[PDB]
Enzyme design. Structure first.
Site, PDB file in Angstrom:
ATOM      1  N   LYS A   1      18.289  11.420  53.759  1.00  0.00           N
ATOM      2  CA  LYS A   1      18.530   9.985  53.993  1.00  0.00           C
ATOM      3  C   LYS A   1      19.645   9.384  53.122  1.00  0.00           C
ATOM      4  O   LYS A   1      20.416   8.580  53.619  1.00  0.00           O
ATOM      5  CB  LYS A   1      17.248   9.177  53.833  1.00  0.00           C
ATOM      6  CG  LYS A   1      16.117   9.538  54.786  1.00  0.00           C
ATOM      7  CD  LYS A   1      14.887   8.776  54.380  1.00  0.00           C
ATOM      8  CE  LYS A   1      13.891   8.576  55.513  1.00  0.00           C
ATOM      9  NZ  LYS A   1      13.059   9.770  55.806  1.00  0.00           N
TER      10      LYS A   1
ATOM     11  N   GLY B   1      13.737  16.595  55.434  1.00  0.00           N
ATOM     12  CA  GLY B   1      12.945  15.375  55.527  1.00  0.00           C
ATOM     13  C   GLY B   1      13.699  14.275  54.813  1.00  0.00           C
ATOM     14  O   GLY B   1      14.919  14.213  54.876  1.00  0.00           O
ATOM     15  N   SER B   2      12.989  13.443  54.073  1.00  0.00           N
ATOM     16  CA  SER B   2      13.610  12.290  53.431  1.00  0.00           C
ATOM     17  C   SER B   2      14.799  12.543  52.505  1.00  0.00           C
ATOM     18  O   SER B   2      15.556  11.615  52.220  1.00  0.00           O
ATOM     19  CB  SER B   2      12.549  11.509  52.703  1.00  0.00           C
ATOM     20  OG  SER B   2      11.410  11.404  53.532  1.00  0.00           O
ATOM     21  N   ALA B   3      14.957  13.786  52.031  1.00  0.00           N
ATOM     22  CA  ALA B   3      16.044  14.175  51.120  1.00  0.00           C
ATOM     23  C   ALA B   3      17.442  14.059  51.717  1.00  0.00           C
ATOM     24  O   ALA B   3      18.431  14.041  50.971  1.00  0.00           O
ATOM     25  CB  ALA B   3      15.819  15.591  50.588  1.00  0.00           C
TER      26      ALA B   3
END
Length: 443
Positions: free
Chosen positions: A191, A187-189
């Site tokens: 980015k 997920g966002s990790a």
């Protein structure tokens, strides 16, 4: 007649007697004993510290062969070489003579290993992990703490665990070393890495303002949680913009993105030395549509273990050089693989601090007296998995802490609240334990 010259009978029996090697001991980086063998009422394995290092060290079978964990993978250097001697015994078991034989051999003891792990950090990680899991009524949880400069593992725990002194009543779910064996969607990790690549290749800079209005790739929409008309690269980091991230990723072809994810370690085995390593999931780029490339840019459609995730962050903390991880104590940082320019890693670190400050998406993981660079997210498996990962002091990092909480039931779902409290306590605690001074005045 001397007894050794005689025929065997009921009271004189030739017997080859094993002289067992003693298994090597496992210690923490400061000398605390974690695993050792004692003579049994044969040798027996003792884990003095109980379930603290359960998943890392694992255990041994009734014959003293490694079965799970580092006991299994280090079995060759740890076991030694059993010796033997030929004796005459009586029917009551008394050794009556020692016989000359080319079969008489001294045992060779196992090699001792000094782990890179620190009992103080393991205890702090272990404690804070179970507080989180028990409070949120979660199914499970995992913590990894690394030395941001060397890649040495400082702590690695999972819940649920088991007592390795009593491994026979341990569930399959209890025995699983989740940090190493379990694939997750980052997920966002992910980015920060997409942003860094765009910066590193010069496809963007710190001045560019991106249009970050929601758009669609064919029929499939790409959108943030809130509408942001335009963001610079700092705001894309800060707000964790899916739109901004996928747009920056789309400035690279599918093969280039793939080769990048791959060189971060996604989709291959780490070969860390732990058994049961997952390979993760990186689909062949030749099979990618533009929508898939974009969703990967915000961490869906590809998977890695938390330990792989934490290792990737060494590219960010060790000045763009990706490090191999260590479970054994290192004298110095191992040679890594350069991924970003030093210049690029410094700025991205700087950007991530914004995630943990008032305007950012992970303020729950801010640590008193320190700048923390972090990411936080929640992925569906309803049932969710909350992650929080980050490093400190952000300008000159020393520690990476990664935390996942699996299926939180009470008091929220979001990884920033859920995995953010234990991240903050573990990070603060670890900085204290390592004797690192605050860089800004305490609140």
């Amino acid at each position: 007649t001397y007894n050794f010259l005689k025929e065997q009978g009921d009271n004189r029996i030739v017997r080859t007697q094993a002289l067992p090697a003693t298994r090597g001991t496992v210690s923490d980086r400061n000398g605390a004993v974690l695993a050792l063998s004692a003579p049994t009422e044969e040798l027996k394995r003792h884990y003095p510290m109980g379930n603290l290092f359960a998943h890392v060290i694992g255990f041994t079978d009734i014959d003293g062969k490694g079965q799970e964990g580092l006991e299994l993978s280090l079995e060759d250097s740890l076991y030694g070489e059993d010796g033997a001697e030929v004796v005459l015994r009586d029917r009551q078991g008394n050794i009556v003579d020692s016989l000359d034989s080319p079969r008489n051999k001294a045992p060779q003891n196992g090699k001792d290993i000094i782990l890179s792990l620190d009992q103080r950090i393991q205890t702090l990680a272990y404690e804070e992990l179970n507080k989180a899991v028990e409070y949120h009524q979660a199914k499970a949880g995992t913590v990894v703490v690394l030395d941001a400069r060397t890649g040495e593992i400082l702590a690695l725990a999972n819940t649920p665990a088991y007592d390795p002194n009593r491994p026979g009543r341990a569930d399959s779910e209890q025995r699983r070393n989740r940090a190493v064996t379990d694939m997750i969607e980052p997920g966002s990790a992910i980015k920060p890495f997409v942003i860094a690549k765009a910066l590193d290749a010069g496809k963007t800079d710190l001045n560019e303002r991106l249009n970050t209005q929601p758009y669609k790739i064919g029929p499939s929409p790409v959108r943030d949680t809130h509408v942001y008309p335009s963001l610079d690269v700092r705001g894309i980091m800060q707000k964790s913009s899916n739109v901004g991230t996928s747009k920056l990723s789309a400035r690279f072809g599918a093969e280039e993105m793939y080769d990048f994810y791959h060189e971060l370690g996604i989709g291959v085995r780490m070969h860390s030395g732990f058994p049961g390593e997952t390979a993760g999931l990186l689909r062949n780029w030749r099979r990618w549509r533009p929508i898939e490339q974009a969703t990967m840019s915000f961490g869906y459609g590809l998977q890695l273990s938390l330990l792989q995730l934490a290792r990737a962050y060494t590219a960010l903390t060790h000045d763009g050089v990706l490090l191999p991880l260590s479970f054994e104590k290192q004298a110095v940082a191992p040679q890594g693989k350069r991924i970003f320019k030093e210049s690029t890693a410094r700025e991205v670190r700087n950007l991530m601090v914004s995630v943990t400050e008032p305007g950012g998406t992970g303020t729950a993981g801010a640590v008193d007296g320190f700048d923390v660079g972090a990411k936080t997210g929640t992925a569906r498996k309803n049932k969710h998995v909350g992650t929080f990962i980050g490093f400190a002091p952000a300008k000159n990092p020393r520690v990476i802490v990664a935390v996942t909480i699996d299926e939180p039931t009470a008091h929220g779902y979001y990884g920033g609240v859920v995995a953010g409290s234990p991240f903050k306590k573990i990070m603060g605690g670890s900085l204290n334990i390592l004797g690192i001074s605050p860089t800004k005045p305490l609140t």
